[PDB]
């Protein structure tokens, strides 16, 4: 019997990643889909199925819901996510799971309590390239890591928008900045500390909309990340070693059906790999899905969640803040 899946906020990544994925996972069944407006609630199911709910109590009440999807802003993720918990039901958290590493750790202990789930959704952790990059780098393609980068840009969005706020949105660092922040945990490892970093807040709005952060392991491996939303599209993360250069493009959101091209230079000698296509958000609904039928909640998501936490709170606290003009 699939999981019946209620969703609290009507979001864009709703209607364009996680809601497609739901409704064609046959382990997932849509049953209510909440909103601040109900015709907006409507508009999703008649596009989703699921009963449509005005307001996101109502539909935590649901004996229909075992399990509630939260894309909603980041700010707003916490005070939800542990009323679903609180609740009894498990939660698929957008990320960033939250705003800071005492609010998730609290979320987690809710959680534990009553044996949930909680996940933040990476989907892109679920997409099978980066471990065919990973097991080409510990094969020796490129040498010895020394240094990495990884950048996330993106060119403004519209007035309104949830990013432009705050105290709902949180801006570029907690929405963009938290990718190529993810990916240096997924590569270099656990051990990563902050060295510095930039963040350029728009005066006007007050939100973070660019910047850049220098962190390092205690090897002195080196991870300088990009991300901004004043910028032209980038997407892209890249590996210098001890013989030879690996970069890719499309690394956090590449299509269900595009084929990554890993790139490789040597001395004299360059190369590119065509990699099977996949569909991420698919994968990582399938994975929630399956670690709530099974009760295998896998230890690893979650600590991984507070260290990504905890360096994210990290660059913002470091940061050298500059408001502009
Ligand atoms: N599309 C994306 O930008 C995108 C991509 C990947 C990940 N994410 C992550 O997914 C989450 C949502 O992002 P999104 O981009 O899909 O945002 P979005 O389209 O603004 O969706 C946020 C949803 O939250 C609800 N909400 C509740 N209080 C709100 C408020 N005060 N202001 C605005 N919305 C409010 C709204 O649902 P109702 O009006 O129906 O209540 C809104 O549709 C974030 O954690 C983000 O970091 C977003
Ligand atoms: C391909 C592409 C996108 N965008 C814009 C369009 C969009 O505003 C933004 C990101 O598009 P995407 O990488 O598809 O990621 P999701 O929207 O799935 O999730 C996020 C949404 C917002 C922040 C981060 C991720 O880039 C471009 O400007 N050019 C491009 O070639
Ligand atoms: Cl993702
Ligand atoms: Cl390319
Ligand atoms: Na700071």
Redesign the pocket.
């Known amino acids: 019997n699939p999981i019946r899946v209620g969703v609290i906020g009507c979001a864009?990544?709703a209607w364009?990643?996680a809601l497609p994925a739901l409704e064609a996972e046959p382990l997932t069944e849509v049953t209510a889909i909440a909103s601040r407006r109900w015709d907006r609630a409507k508009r999703f199911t008649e596009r989703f199925g699921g009963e449509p709910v005005e307001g996101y109590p109502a539909l935590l009440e649901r004996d229909d819901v075992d399990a509630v999807y939260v894309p909603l802003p980041a700010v707003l993720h916490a005070e939800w996510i542990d009323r679903a918990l609180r609740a009894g039901k498990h939660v698929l958290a957008e990320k960033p799971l939250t705003t800071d590493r005492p609010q998730a750790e609290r979320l987690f202990a809710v959680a534990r309590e009553r044996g949930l789930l909680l996940m933040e959704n990476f989907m892109f952790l679920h997409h099978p390239q980066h471990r065919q990059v990973a097991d080409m780098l510990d094969e020796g393609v490129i040498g010895e890591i020394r240094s990495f980068a990884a950048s996330?840009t993106?060119?403004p969005?519209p007035q309104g928008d949830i990013?432009y706020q705050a105290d709902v949105g949180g801006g570029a660092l907690l929405?963009?900045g938290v990718?190529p922040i993810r990916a240096a945990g997924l590569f270099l490892g656990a051990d990563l500390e902050f060295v510095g970093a930039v963040l350029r807040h728009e005066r006007d709005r007050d939100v973070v909309v660019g910047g850049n952060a220098l962190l390092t392991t205690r090897q002195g491996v080196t991870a300088q990340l990009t991300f901004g939303?004043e910028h032209?599209?980038t997407?892209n993360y890249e590996f210098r070693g001890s013989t030879g250069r690996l970069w890719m493009n499309?690394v956090?959101?590449p299509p269900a059906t595009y084929q990554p091209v890993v790139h490789i230079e040597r001395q004299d000698h360059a190369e590119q790999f065509v990699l099977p296509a996949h569909d991420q958000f698919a994968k990582s609904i399938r994975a929630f899905a399956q670690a709530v039928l099974s009760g295998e909640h896998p230890r690893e998501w979650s600590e991984d969640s507070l260290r990504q936490a905890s360096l994210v709170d990290a660059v913002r606290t470091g940061a050298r803040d500059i408001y502009f003009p």
């Open positions: 864009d990544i364009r990643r996330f993106i060119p969005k990013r929405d963009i990718f939303m032209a599209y997407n499309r956090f959101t």
